[PDB]
Design a protein around this ligand. Structure first.
Ligand SMILES: Nc1ncnc2c1ncn2[C@@H]1O[C@H](COP(=O)(O)OP(=O)(O)OP(=O)(O)O)[C@@H](O)[C@H]1O
Ligand SMILES: Nc1ncnc2c1ncn2[C@@H]1O[C@H](COP(=O)(O)OP(=O)(O)OP(=O)(O)O)[C@@H](O)[C@H]1O
Ligand SMILES: Nc1ncnc2c1ncn2[C@@H]1O[C@H](COP(=O)(O)OP(=O)(O)OP(=O)(O)O)[C@@H](O)[C@H]1O
Ligand SMILES: Nc1ncnc2c1ncn2[C@@H]1O[C@H](COP(=O)(O)OP(=O)(O)OP(=O)(O)O)[C@@H](O)[C@H]1O
Ligand SMILES: Nc1ncnc2c1ncn2[C@@H]1O[C@H](COP(=O)(O)OP(=O)(O)OP(=O)(O)O)[C@@H](O)[C@H]1O
Ligand SMILES: Nc1ncnc2c1ncn2[C@@H]1O[C@H](COP(=O)(O)OP(=O)(O)OP(=O)(O)O)[C@@H](O)[C@H]1O
Ligand SMILES: [Cl-]
Ligand SMILES: [Cl-]
Ligand SMILES: [Cl-]
Ligand SMILES: [Cl-]
Ligand SMILES: [Mg+2]
Ligand SMILES: [Mg+2]
Ligand SMILES: [Mg+2]
Ligand SMILES: [Mg+2]
Lengths: 244, 268, 244, 244, 268, 244
């Protein structure tokens, strides 16, 4: 298998819908992140959230193809990243853009303890056809980055406890059972909504390094800290990469 | 049974192995300072009281060292309680409080040592206690700080952050390690009573009692730090201690002459 | 409960018998440690090993009490620490003594990524009576330090896979069953040899912060790295401290 | 005049009686100090407080000379320094002793942003005779250090707003008038109590670098921050050193 | 007036309060080593002169300790003046020069101590001076370095960077702190003269003089460091000093027997 | 051969007689050192100079053996080191003592760019007998340290251009010819004075790493800078260690 480029890196993906709750959720998260800076070297990546749904609504009404909708949604993930970095600026944390992440992440992680970027990949007008909704979103882009770097882990910070057998905020919420652990191949064979991109399961099947990804509730202080230490406080997803 | 059998187990087994532990227990027992007596001077009960309490005890020490070899350890007192209260309110752990209390016991040892310096009696310390052999042989006495050296590695109590092993335990452990013949605690009461004599009208004096009898009557944490009673039951060399009143003139002199003033607490 | 003094610290205890195997075991361990320096802030503590057994043999033949034997064994843990630090000196790693660890660890971990010290506590001639073998040894001292600091974890690096139901190198080796997980209270109620100090179980009962300690095989490269990420590759010991 | 050894250093002296108030005063001070670490290079020195008065009471009852009382009081300033450093340990701050301050302060301020020490000087049994109370205490020792280093300033953190014309907590409190600014020679010609050592005014007369020292109320959050920026929020004391 | 009144002021007032200062002044006065004599040996005036000066003084020390308890401090000398001159030309402050001079006084104490080692007399040091009590009691003498421990916290002079408190002041302050009965300065002149006898033809010898009389005749900075005269006037225990010539055989022996060789300087 | 402990270290030895010239020589040297701090990792060691000759004169008059004279001369090398470190304190440079150099140099060179120590070895009262002058002095101790660490070089800073065929300041100065290059074995077979310890040639014969040592004139600004880059501006001494 290929070598690991940044074997000591921890990647953390923050959901757009977590950021959408405003100060009530962002301030405790910012305080937890601040305490993690002396413990880990962090790449923090933000998702898009509800504003991407509005631009999808306007763009689909205008008839725009999926290659037009993808950079419009990625722009909203960039804005969440600017907001989070501003709250951490006094700790030396800045936001950096796609070209900087792909070529100069190593020197930026030498200058400071953490860096903020966007979780969406730069697929631009070369997004895949098929669905009218861009498939390669924030969960997928964060995993692609983390596996290519050979990072020590990727943790996904959500607004629910983890993956359930049905939407825990939807019509069938009464039948929703929590899944402490599952595999990417098991999830891919299921039908119905998930809290993570369906394309995340596809890139997990071709992964080379990362063996597990945990989804945890960012609205409960302390769970992100525990997950970064490998404690089981959410849903564990096995990717299919085998250990030595 | 054999030295060769002990050495084979020592090389081949874990130190936790019961077979190894049992063979080590049959080893010979050497006493390092068998003719010395350890004397613990209370911090809050004696030294904090000033001239009226300390000056007569200084006279007794000078007189006693003519026929006795003495190791004299100092308690801490009210300045340590103030530090414990500040640090506990901040949420600091027991290991930090232990370092703070050691410095107060050092203060009291230095003050006592300066009253004794013109009699040749020094203050000793360090992890090796290397000044003890020569001083005991020439002037028959030394002064040391009673606090154990555990510092950040101090074992916490089951509840709270007050260090459980303080100057009473420190003095006792030195007596047991050196194989001393006698251990005397000097405080501000005639001895052990059935209740705290300062806060109860009808306490009855107890001349002699075992550790098990103390626990059976609710006296586990009375005039002595409670871990001292447990260490006493594990001890190899010092199987009893004596508690005497230092405010009574001549009480220490008479305890050293073998008079049964105060309370005698026996391991069994 | 008391506050955490160094919440971002990882403590690692290296067994004396691992160091006793010489270059064949030390060189792969040194290479693994080198790769961990950019990932964690480490306090590395060494045990005593076979030379402490020889000084116990001479001292017990001379009749010496347990308060004499304790600093003689701690000196051998210090020598293992000087050896390990010399191999890491080119990475900026030095050995530091007991007074420095208790008072100036914070500034030393700001100057460099890792520090080496001795795992034995400074009980000196104030060791507890009862057994003729000093009870507070390297496992016990390392745990006392890690819990007082409120560190993020303690990992114990052994020359076996973990704890078994009997000595896997002893007379009853045929009946030895591996224990993936156990509790300190369960171990304390058992009789027979263990790979860790019996007094370690006692200080676990009064612990304030550390909830679990893992014992892993330092002769298998990669297991220390996995344990520091919370992966289960040895025996997990539950201390009895409850999480929030 | 002699050269400046550490021209970029800010020295801050914390009164013993401030520390004596416990967590109610220490916790807000610790939080203010934490925010100052990225802004200034700090040497933080602690005074003695009420425990030195008790050891003076026992020692004077025993008849001890002033050379015996001086190191007994300095020990209490050391304990306040250990307490303050423990609260800042997670920021990389440790306590250092008299020999380290005099010879290795420069390398310690390169490893970390701030260092804690004792404000009492090491006069030991060579304290000056005359009064039965040691004259060279925490204010005096902190100024001696700051002027010898040629530091950029010294700020004294008190439990009152500054210097008054009489004790604002004493019998004549009704006639106490606040002094926004004064000179050391003016104070030395007065009789009555002050919040600073009388010997501080003597060493100010022979100073070579420091031109002013401000006394501020450490019980009001924000005043230490303002004083370190040269804002006038307490009593300014002019030393008599002339500017260029 | 009362211990309770002193303790109330100690808790309620600033240490600068004149009422507190006056109550502390009425405290009892304990002397730590009242029967000892401090002897200062000049660095430039004696030790730098080598065998011809040091060997006879070694003989006098060995003979004197039979009936006297001696604390012997060493000066620094020409090696310290060289360091002061290098450091002053660089613009270094008085606190740095003080550390440099202490190491030279340490050198001279070590050289003297090796000539006395076979007589059992040790070199002592450390912030606690913890080896003094036992050594004085058993061999009646100790050697120490005369420089004070102020180091970087040294009070500067009003002009220049030369430390004003050096080995003369250090020796004197130890005598005053220990409550010693006698303080003797050993240098290379018979005593104080009306002018420097090395550079003036007609200097007249002065057998006895007060500090105020010395200042009135321009001798404030003569054979002794000028701060010694000011410390002498503040002292509680040592209210006079004697200056004698160490190059005259037997001069130290006779000063210790109470003969009035040299100059006696009185505080008042 | 043994491994190199600090392969990236440059060692620089400053002659006592250079320091003896005072500010006229020290100030230009300090300015050159200041400019070298961002270019090399430096261990700077000072010799003793003329004050050691005076203490030799007093001690030999008192009859003292060579084991007494050795620590008396080393003390003067320590004083030169305190002076040099004070001039560099504003750059983060401090003096450190013999026990710190032998055990904690690695962490000190991580906290700051350069460290100052004494060049004399701690032979104390265990100096070798034979001559009444201590043989293991500042040149010898600096080489012993540099070779044991496996440092990248050792440069000796003198008050002359290099080694001559006779003393260039002595009686036979007219016949003195400059030696651009020589070997330790060639020098050891000669008789007469040298600018370096005779024992330096002995420890060069048993060296394991350092192949050459250059002696340069510290009174000419720029020569120390050039020597640290391997330019030939003085006398090169070949030790006898062979390259790969
Ligand atoms: N099987 C399922 N298990 C758990 N949650 C589900 C499931 N199916 C749907 N959901 C819903 O998905 C929501 C999470 O929304 P989503 O994943 O779109 O937000 P996000 O990840 O914060 O946004 P972004 O992808 O832009 O970063 C949950 O609040 C939950 O209601
Ligand atoms: N049953 C009892 N019998 C006698 N004394 C008791 C009893 N219970 C409590 N005490 C109290 O215990 C006190 C002695 O312990 P304390 O810790 O107060 O002093 P100390 O030994 O000087 O402490 P330190 O040496 O740590 O300063 C006595 O003054 C007494 O009032
Ligand atoms: N129940 C058990 N499970 C596993 N190993 C055991 C057990 N009982 C005994 N052992 C033995 O303990 C050995 C480990 O030895 P030990 O723990 O004394 O070494 P160490 O921890 O490296 O030394 P130190 O305590 O000085 O650091 C194992 O190799 C094994 O043979
Ligand atoms: N003229 C004055 N102006 C202001 N305060 C005064 C004056 N005279 C006396 N004080 C008293 O001095 C008190 C400060 O006490 P002090 O200076 O002894 O404490 P500290 O500086 O915290 O202690 P330490 O010197 O041990 O650091 C004030 O609370 C005030 O009551
Ligand atoms: N009025 C005076 N009477 C006598 N001696 C004087 C007088 N004025 C100056 N001196 C000189 O002071 C000298 C003694 O002090 P000096 O500092 O030179 O020696 P020291 O005490 O050995 O110094 P150190 O101990 O610091 O090395 C005498 O040698 C003497 O020449
Ligand atoms: N063959 C020689 N070549 C060059 N210089 C020589 C030779 N022989 C003697 N010297 C003299 O040695 C002097 C250098 O003195 P030395 O080496 O003792 O000083 P240093 O190295 O500065 O002192 P330290 O050894 O205490 O650091 C030169 O100035 C020169 O006069
Ligand atoms: Cl999808
Ligand atoms: Cl055990
Ligand atoms: Cl005052
Ligand atoms: Cl030579
Ligand atoms: Mg999601
Ligand atoms: Mg083990
Ligand atoms: Mg004050
Ligand atoms: Mg030379």
């Amino acid at each position: 298998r290929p070598i690991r480029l940044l074997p000591w890196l921890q990647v953390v993906k923050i959901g757009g819908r977590v950021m959408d709750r405003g100060a009530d959720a962002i301030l405790p998260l910012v305080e937890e992140l601040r305490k993690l800076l002396p413990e880990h070297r962090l790449l923090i990546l933000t998702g898009a959230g509800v504003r991407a749904r509005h631009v999808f609504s306007v763009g689909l009404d205008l008839g725009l193809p999926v290659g037009s909708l993808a950079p419009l949604a990625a722009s909203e993930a960039g804005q969440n990243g600017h907001i989070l970095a501003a709250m951490l600026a006094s700790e030396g944390v800045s936001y950096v853009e796609h070209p900087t992440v792909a070529d100069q992440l190593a020197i930026h992680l030498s200058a400071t303890r953490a860096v903020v970027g966007s979780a969406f990949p730069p697929y631009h007008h070369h997004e895949f056809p098929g669905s009218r909704i861009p498939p390669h979103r924030a969960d997928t882009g964060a995993f692609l980055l983390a596996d290519a770097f050979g990072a020590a882990g990727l943790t996904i910070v959500e607004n629910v406890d983890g993956i359930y057998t049905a939407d825990p905020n939807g019509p069938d919420r009464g039948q929703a059972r929590f899944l402490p652990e599952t595999s990417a191949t098991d999830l891919a064979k299921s039908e119905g909504p998930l809290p993570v991109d369906r394309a995340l399961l596809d890139v997990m099947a071709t992964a080379r390094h990362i063996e597990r990804v945990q989804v945890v509730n960012g609205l409960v202080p302390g769970r992100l800290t525990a997950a970064l230490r490998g404690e089981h406080v959410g849903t564990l997803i096995r990717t299919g990469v085998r250990p030595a | 049974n054999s030295t060769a059998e002990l050495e084979e187990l020592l090389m081949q087994r874990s130190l936790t192995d019961p077979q190894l532990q049992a063979a080590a227990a049959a080893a010979a027992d050497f006493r390092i300072l068998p003719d010395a007596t350890v004397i613990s001077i209370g911090g809050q009960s004696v030294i904090d009281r000033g001239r009226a309490a300390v000056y007569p005890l200084v006279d007794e020490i000078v007189a006693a060292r003519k026929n006795h070899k003495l190791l004299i350890g100092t308690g801490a007192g009210t300045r340590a309680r103030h530090l414990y209260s500040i640090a506990a309110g901040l949420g600091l752990p027991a290991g930090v409080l232990a370092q703070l209390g050691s410095s107060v016991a050092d203060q009291n040892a230095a003050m006592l040592g300066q009253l004794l310096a013109k009699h040749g009696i020094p203050v000793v310390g360090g992890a090796g206690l290397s000044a003890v052999p020569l001083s005991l042989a020439e002037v028959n006495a030394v002064v040391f700080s009673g606090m154990p050296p555990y510092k950040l590695w101090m074992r916490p109590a089951a509840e709270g952050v007050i260090p459980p092993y303080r100057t009473d335990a420190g003095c006792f452990l030195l007596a047991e390690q050196f194989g001393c013949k006698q251990m005397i605690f000097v405080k501000d009461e005639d001895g052990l009573y059935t209740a705290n004599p300062k806060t109860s009208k009808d306490a009855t004096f107890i001349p002699r009692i075992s550790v098990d009898e103390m626990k059976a009557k609710g006296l586990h944490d009375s005039i002595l730090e409670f871990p001292v009673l447990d260490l006493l039951q594990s001890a190899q060399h010092v199987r009893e201690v004596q508690v005497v009143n230092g405010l009574v003139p001549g009480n220490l002199t008479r305890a050293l002459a073998g008079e049964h003033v105060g309370t005698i607490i026996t391991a069994s």
